[PDB]
Amino acid sequence: PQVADLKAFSKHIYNAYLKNFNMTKKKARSILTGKASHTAPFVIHDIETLWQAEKGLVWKQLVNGLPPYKEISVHVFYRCQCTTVETVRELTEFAKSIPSFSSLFLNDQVTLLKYGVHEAIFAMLASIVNKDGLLVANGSGFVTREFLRSLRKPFSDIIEPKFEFAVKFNALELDDSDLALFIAAIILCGDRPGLMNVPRVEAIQDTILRALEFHLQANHPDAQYLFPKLLQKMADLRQLVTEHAQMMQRIKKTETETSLHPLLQEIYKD
Ligand SMILES: CC(C)N(Cc1ccccc1OCCCCCC(=O)O)C(=O)c1ccc(-c2ccco2)cc1
Ligand SMILES: CCCCCCCO[C@@H]1O[C@H](CO)[C@@H](O)[C@H](O)[C@H]1O
Ligand SMILES: CCCCCCCO[C@@H]1O[C@H](CO)[C@@H](O)[C@H](O)[C@H]1O
């Protein structure tokens, strides 16, 4: 009985995911491998191709919108910020499409997103990443990892650890239906500081994890240890975000000319 109920639960979480996320891992890998399209992403690998992309790529955020121009490395950081805020919006709608999330009081919803979105972002990031770079502008562009490594500190350093995590994460070969459950488990996390109804969130988190575990038994029947492996990734994501926050703190202290989106400021506020 347990197994059958969880299967319907996982399907509703998967529908929430399909309804709300801009791009699926299925779509991303088809672009990154080159099978899908009559057109390939524009490759951004240096200043000239970045400039050409800003001139000719369609970006969710108009360039004129980004904070005033400062320099190549900050400009790139502003696009990272713009896409992060866009992904917070999507993750917020994903969570609200999960009834047990929407049944929580609104202040606990905020606490869960506050301390969960960056873990979920960096997990979902792996879907648009390969070892050579990542997709941008809805799959219109591909920014090489080498280019991002060429940016000056501290902007290059905040970027490379995410690639390291993503490449290892992609070798577990999760599909979008796995990720929907994995991301939901990250958001509904009973450990977040200042949660009001902890036992409620813990019970939801436990339900998602049981669903996840049964989900991988059907969808990945030959992958030994894959469920405990994903629990370790969820611990690894906390450490990745702790370091990310530390690096963001340094950027705030030493890059005083770089502006930070106020919503992200609220997230880091502690
Ligand atoms: C995660 C995801 C949303 N990113 C950002 C990203 C990817 C990998 C590593 C790090 C990183 O962001 C670190 C700074 C984040 C600050 C905000 C915060 O903490 O809230 C991207 O999709 C992205 C990457 C590169 C570009 C880009 C356009 C032009 C040339 O390059 C555009 C978007
Ligand atoms: C259900 C709507 C009514 C909600 C009223 C309760 C709001 O409490 C506030 O919730 C925030 C976490 O989200 C915390 O940051 C604040 O410290 C806390 O004071
Ligand atoms: C769109 C959902 C994601 C929002 C993430 C940002 C949360 O910021 C927090 O908002 C609370 C008010 O609700 C304040 O009480 C906290 O001091 C602040 O840290």
Cα–Cα distance list, 121 to 53, 54, 233 (Å) = 24, 24, 13
Question: What is the C-alpha to C-alpha distance for residues 114 and 87, in angstroms, rounded to an integer?
Answer: 13
Within 10 angstroms of residue 99's Cβ, the number of other Cβ atoms is 10
Q: Is 121 in the pocket of ligand 1 (CB under 6 A)?
A: yes
Residue nearest to atom 21 of ligand 1 (CA): 80
* Phi–psi pair at 204, nearest 5 degrees: -65, -45
Question: What is the C-alpha to C-alpha distance for residues 113 and 84, in angstroms, rounded to an integer?
Answer: 13
**Nearest in space to 187 (alpha carbons), one of 94, 83, 66:** 94
Give the DSSP H or E segment for 44.
strand 42-44
**Residue 51 is part of a domain; what is its CATH number?**
1.10.565.10
Ligand 1 test: best mutation among 58, 84, 157, 267, most atoms within 8 Å of CB?
84
Task: Write down the residue that tokens 């990542």 correspond to.
Answer: 134
Report how many domains make up the chain: 1
**Nearest in space to 161 (alpha carbons), one of 86, 264, 236:** 236
Cα–Cα distance list, 126 to 26, 101, 120, 139 (Å) = 12, 24, 10, 14
Cα–Cα distance list, 265 to 32, 35, 106, 148, 194 (Å) = 33, 40, 20, 23, 18
Structure tokens at 210: 């049981």
Give the strand order in the sheet containing 42-44. Answer: 42-44, 141-144, 133-136, 129-130
Ligand 2 test: best mutation among 103, 105, 107, most atoms within 8 Å of CB?
107
Which residue range forms the structural domain that includes residue 178?
1-270
Q: Give this entry's resolution in angstroms.
A: 2.0
Residue 109 alpha carbon, nearest atom of ligand 3? 2
Experimental method: X-ray
Ligand 3 test: best mutation among 87, 114, 121, most atoms within 8 Å of CB?
114
CA of 200 to the centre of ligand 2 (A): 17
Structure tokens at 239: 């450490």
Question: What is the C-alpha to C-alpha distance for residues 246 and 235, in angstroms, rounded to an integer?
Answer: 17
